[PDB]
Design a protein around this nucleic acid. Structure first.
Ligand SMILES: [Mg+2]
Ligand SMILES: [Mg+2]
Ligand SMILES: [Mg+2]
Ligand SMILES: [Mg+2]
Ligand SMILES: [Mg+2]
Ligand SMILES: [Mg+2]
Ligand SMILES: [Mg+2]
Ligand SMILES: [Mg+2]
Ligand SMILES: [Mg+2]
Ligand SMILES: [Mg+2]
Ligand SMILES: [Mg+2]
Lengths: 192, 154, 125, 150, 105, 67, 93, 143
RNA sequence: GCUCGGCCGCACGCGCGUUACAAUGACUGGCGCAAAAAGUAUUUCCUGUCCUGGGAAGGUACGGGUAAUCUUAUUAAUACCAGUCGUGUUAGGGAUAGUUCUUUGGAAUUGUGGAUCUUGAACGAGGAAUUUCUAGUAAGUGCAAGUCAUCAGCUUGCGUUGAUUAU
């Protein structure tokens, strides 16, 4: 039988419509269908292993990233589970089919390469890769959570939850994530 | 819980204790901490002596509860409290025990440094000039005259 | 209208009590801080006793003309004894001897606590 | 059927035995106890008032598993870290007063026993026939209640 | 038959030599008729570590010498009489190789 | 926000450029509504293999160099 | 009311909503029965969000409702309390 | 002479050592002498059941598997307790069943996860006097 | 050689670091997970069991080891479950300081270290700059060993938890 996520979230409840992300994500594999986002896997070894990482394992990783406070996946797996419960209680959708969308949206499609010649700082038009795109997307999403999450009674599992939602919506006023997603392209569309 | 009945009056936002000790409305033990003499754990002790509710908010205690504390501090040893939980123990070669009050404490010190100012002991002289006594290292330590000795909140 | 710690006399009877043997009778013991009690209850020296008597003669022989004979010592480790009050002992610090008038307050405290061992810093450049 | 403590998360069991000693109040909360004195060297005094019962409560669970364990060891085995402030945290030993009492009391209760055989730890505490039976009952009672959560 | 359980202990600063005694002690004991030998057992190799700051005067970067002295202890058990042992100990064992013996019944 | 995101995939990974030694130059093939098939030589940044798919927000480009 | 040191300073002028630690008997019941007021999901935060009630207080209000078979717990951790108002939030005054 | 009907399989992960004994019975799961339901990280508990489910209540129901683990860290042990199960279920079928049934389960697990049969090679890496840690070093002011 | 001072003296200027600004947290309680090191001539070294103290620490009541045999196959801490606090320089943080008690040492006063109750400062994530760092690696987290009578915020090692980005 099908191993649901956290015990209650069918993986086959999602599909990657765009071809871009098809190989640069995890929902799709048999091996990916995990109960727990903890694999102590050995990704990050070859030069593209990162791929085969169950999308959420990646989220958890990028999540335990602030110095002193972090470095302990144990907990982070939690902050992500609660956040999924919370995302569900609002749109009652398969929260992976949410987080997933968000991942696809929050990734800038264009960036500018700083190429300076003798003091002058010029830039060019650059198209952002897929692996890079997803990486940026998650990094971004989480990046923001902490932003508000600080001296706030709002919790990461809440901040994050509230983020993954709007990040899927493209709501440019409710996602520190998509703000840059747009600006980076905009500024980049200027330098180009 | 916090199932108050007569809001604005069935409660007292600020209580008066030992002179300038005004109290905050949150939790009782902790509220006590503002008193220059009681702290994190001493407050908790107090509530076990006066059988007063700890978990319960602050200010849900009448003047009886207030005096229970003013005198509890005047001769603490009387209600019990082992000699070793007190702030002051065996003073000036005679005075047995006390419990450094918000105002008592302030002057007790003014008298001991005075006790030493006249004596002219190293540790004594140190306080006068204004320099750590035990913390010894002066090279890098507290520069731009940071907080010397004896500290008062403001 | 000023008084003294625990009664300067009670102690002269407390120290020179029935058994005025060891400079610090177990009586005075109850009075001192743990560190001091530690030392005496541990192993205090005898030299500290002949130094004692040296102040003794200085306190009496001197007329009420309040001119005490300064007693010199390196025993900066000595903890002022009750009967040691009133005399002016010269204590070495590093350079010379320091003359200090012993007040009732400096008892139980180390005799060294008054012989400044270094001149703190003045400044300019 | 039947179940032993090894079949019940004791974090759950102690929450049970702590009380079996309450209703029965076979004990007698010593003096220094209520007298506020958190275990070891920490910040605030415990919060739950029956900590006295809980401590022993588990102490039984501990001895039922590690027979012959000692005072200074349980003292460690409880698990404590110390914020010395600037100096990093060092591991800390517990309190020998509350601890040694609890063993004496559990012995008066006919649950603990002082072995006078093993020449290594002569007089270490161990479960007793009557003593350990009492435990499995609490355990099985809890065990059966867990299986009862249809 | 006055059987005495003999304990052969061998401790040595280097493996080269201690392995020869061990290897040959057994080689020799198996070949006697009044003999019963418990295989040569190798205790855990103890290592004494000494880390030292190279240079004498504390100048130049940090240089550390990690010096080691390994001590291998091998233990052999024997079923024999008192003469039997002195018969098998008649080797030509290297220097610095301590051999201790325990006799029980 | 009405963009003309034509999806194109990687035909051949040319070389690396921008002395920032991190940018990659790639030959593309398109698959979208507008045209399709048209081949371009665009400049990527980031992890990219042969055959991936990249959303170009401007088909009128194709800077290039190979020395 | 404010004696704090070198804290004021260019930036946010956000008045800290005055949460309360007391609830009058005139509102006690009325509020407990009205869970559908604090959004669909109820966490230590949301509760404070709509009612000006600090977590510590909010919890009891949660456990209370949890007790009155009115609310169900989703997950309970350190500071993460996930509660669902049984039946569905269908209260609009 | 004797000869119990038993299998001895082990799992390991950065010092974590899993002693797994498999004898035929009615589906017992002992870990250090207790039921899986009580492992420390209530979370990772699932990790251990992954093999069980991945195969089917079938194989688990027929046998009694007792494991003892005294590895290093909470997480690691779990990985070994995991690896022992997987190795044992397979190890059982080798000498006590058709060598073909073993191949089925082996690929079965291998396909889902290698950490059940393979051994997480990496260990810790020793420090160096070059600095404060294994690869970090004392600051270096240049200017 | 001896007695007593000093190298720690303070307006300040540099350089390693330690702790932290807190709810991805603090405090109370519960929870058999580790590695590597060490250890005596009689009591003098590791110290288990037991007794006494609120506590640090005592006693000598019963004991093993000059070591895969004894301190130990365990006494780590982060982590995990429960509970209290609930944005509040609050105490997060713990500097400074005041009696008391305890251990090392003839001696600690220019606080050896440790315990207790108070006191409770800057700090609200840090300018110009600038250092290491690609995997069981960074980081966090404790444990050892050197020094050592007593003193680690240093050093040399050890393990647990464990990732972003590159190739
Ligand atoms: Mg704890
Ligand atoms: Mg926590
Ligand atoms: Mg002892
Ligand atoms: Mg040891
Ligand atoms: Mg509090
Ligand atoms: Mg303190
Ligand atoms: Mg002093
Ligand atoms: Mg100190
Ligand atoms: Mg460290
Ligand atoms: Mg030592
Ligand atoms: Mg040391």
């Amino acid at each position: 039988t099908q191993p649901k996520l956290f015990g209650k979230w069918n993986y086959d409840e999602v599909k990657i419509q765009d071809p871009c992300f098809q190989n640069y994500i995890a929902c799709t594999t048999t091996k990916s269908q995990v109960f727990v986002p903890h694999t102590a896997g050995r990704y990050q070894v070859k030069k593209f292993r990162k791929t085969q990482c169950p999308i959420v394992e990646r989220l958890i990783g990028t999540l335990m990233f602030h110095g002193r406070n972090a470095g302990k996946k144990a907990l982070c797996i939690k902050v992500v589970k609660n956040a999924f419960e919370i995302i569900h209680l609002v749109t009652g959708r398969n929260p992976l089919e949410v987080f997933v969308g968000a991942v696809q949206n929050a990734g800038p499609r264009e960036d500018s390469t700083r190429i300076g010649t003798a003091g002058v700082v010029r830039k060019q038009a650059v198209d952002v890769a897929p692996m890079r795109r997803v990486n940026l997307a998650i990094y971004f999403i989480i990046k923001g959570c902490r932003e508000s999450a600080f001296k706030s009674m709002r919790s990461i599992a809440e901040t994050l939850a509230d983020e993954i939602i709007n990040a899927e919506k493209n709501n440019t006023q409710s996602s520190w994530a998509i703000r840059k997603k747009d600006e980076i392209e905009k500024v980049a569309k200027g330098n180009r | 819980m916090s199932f108050v009945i007569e809001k604005e009056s069935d409660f007292k936002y600020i209580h008066r204790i030992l002179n300038t000790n005004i109290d905050g409305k949150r939790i009782t033990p902790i509220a006590l901490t503002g008193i220059r003499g009681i702290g994190r754990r001493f407050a908790y002790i107090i509530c076990k002596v006066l059988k007063i509710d700890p978990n319960a908010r602050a200010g849900l205690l009448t003047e009886d509860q207030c005096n229970k504390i003013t005198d509890l501090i005047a001769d603490p040893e009387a209600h019990g409290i082992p000699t070793w939980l007190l702030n002051r123990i065996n003073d000036f070669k005679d005075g047995k025990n006390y419990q450094m009050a918000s105002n008592t404490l302030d002057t007790k010190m003014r008298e001991d440094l005075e006790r030493l100012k006249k004596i002219k002991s190293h540790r004594g002289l140190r306080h006068f000039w204004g320099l750590k006594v035990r913390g010894q290292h002066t090279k890098t330590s507290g520069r731009h005259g940071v907080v010397c000795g004896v500290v008062r909140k403001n | 209208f000023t008084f003294r710690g625990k009664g300067l006399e009670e102690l002269t009877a407390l120290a020179s009590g029935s058994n005025s043997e060891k400079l610090i009778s177990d009586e005075l013991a109850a009075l001192f801080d743990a560190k001091t009690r530690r030392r005496v209850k541990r192993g205090i020296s005898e030299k500290y006793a002949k130094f004692v008597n040296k102040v003794r003669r200085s306190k009496e022989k001197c007329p009420a003309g309040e001119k005490p004979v300064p007693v010199k010592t390196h025993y900066r480790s000595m903890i002022v004894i009750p009967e040691l009050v009133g005399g002016i002992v010269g204590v070495y610090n590093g350079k010379e001897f320091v003359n200090v008038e012993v007040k009732f307050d400096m008892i139980g405290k180390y005799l060294a606590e008054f012989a400044m061992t270094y001149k703190p810093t003045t400044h300019g450049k | 059927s039947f179940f032993t403590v090894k079949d019940v998360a004791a974090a759950d069991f102690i929450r049970e035995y702590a009380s079996h000693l309450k209703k029965a109040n076979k004990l007698s909360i010593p003096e220094f106890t209520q007298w506020t004195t958190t275990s070891v060297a920490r910040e605030l005094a415990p919060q739950d008032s029956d900590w006295v019962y809980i401590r022993t409560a588990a102490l039984a669970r501990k001895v039922y598993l590690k027979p012959h364990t000692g005072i200074s060891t349980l003292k460690h085995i409880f698990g404590s870290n110390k914020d010395r402030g600037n100096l990093r945290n060092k591991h800390q030993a517990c309190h020998g007063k509350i601890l040694r009492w609890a063993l004496k009391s559990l012995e008066d209760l006919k649950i603990i026993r002082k072995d006078k055989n093993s020449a290594t730890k002569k007089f270490s505490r161990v479960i007793t026939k009557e003593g350990m039976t009492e435990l499995n009952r609490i355990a099985t009672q809890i065990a059966i209640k867990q299986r009862q959560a249809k | 038959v006055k059987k005495v359980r003999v304990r052969i202990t061998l401790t040595c600063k280097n493996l080269k030599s201690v392995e020869k005694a061990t290897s040959e002690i057994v080689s020799r004991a198996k070949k006697t008729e009044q003999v019963e030998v418990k295989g040569p057992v190798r205790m855990p190799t103890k290592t004494l570590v000494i880390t030292v700051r190279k240079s004498p005067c504390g100048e130049g970067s940090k240089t550390w010498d990690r010096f080691e002295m390994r001590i291998y202890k091998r233990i052999i058990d024997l079923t024999c009489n008192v003469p039997d042992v002195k018969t098998i100990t008649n080797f030509r064992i290297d220097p610095g190789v301590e051999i201790e013996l325990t006799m029980t019944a | 926000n009405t963009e003309e995101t034509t999806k194109a995939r990687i035909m051949d990974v040319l070389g690396k450029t921008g002395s920032r030694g991190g940018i990659t130059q790639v030959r593309v093939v398109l698959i979208s509504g507008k045209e399709e098939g048209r081949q371009l030589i665009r400049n990527v940044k980031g992890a990219c293999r042969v055959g991936d798919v990249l959303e170009l927000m401007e088909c009128e480009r194709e800077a290039r160099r190979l020395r | 009311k404010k004696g704090g040191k070198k804290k004021w300073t260019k930036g946010k002028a956000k008045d800290k909503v005055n949460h309360a630690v007391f609830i009058e008997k005139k509102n006690v019941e009325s509020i407990i029965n009205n869970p559908s007021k604090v959004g669909k999901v109820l966490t230590v935060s949301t509760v404070v969000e709509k009612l000006k009630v600090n977590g510590s207080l909010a919890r009891q209000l949660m456990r209370t409702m949890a007790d009155r078979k009115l609310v169900e717990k989703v997950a309970k951790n350190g500071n993460q309390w996930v509660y669902s108002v049984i039946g569905g939030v269908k209260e609009d005054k | 002479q004797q000869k119990p009907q038993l299998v001895q399989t082990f799992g390991r992960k950065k010092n974590a050592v899993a002693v797994a004994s498999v004898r035929p019975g009615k589906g017992l799961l002992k870990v250090n002498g207790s039921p899986i339901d009580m492992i420390n990280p209530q979370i990772l508990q699932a990790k251990i059941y992954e093999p069980i489910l991945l195969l089917g209540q079938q194989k688990f129901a027929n046998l009694d598997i007792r494991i003892r683990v005294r590895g290093s860290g909470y997480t690691s042990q779990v990985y070994a307790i995991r690896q022992a199960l997987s190795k044992g279920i397979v190890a059982y079928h080798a000498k006590y069943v058709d060598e073909n049934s073993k191949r089925e389960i082996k690929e079965q697990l291998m396909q889902y996860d290698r950490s059940l049969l393979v051994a997480d090679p990496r260990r810790m890496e020793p420090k160096k006097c070059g600095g404060r840690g294994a690869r970090s070093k004392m600051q270096k002011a240049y200017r």
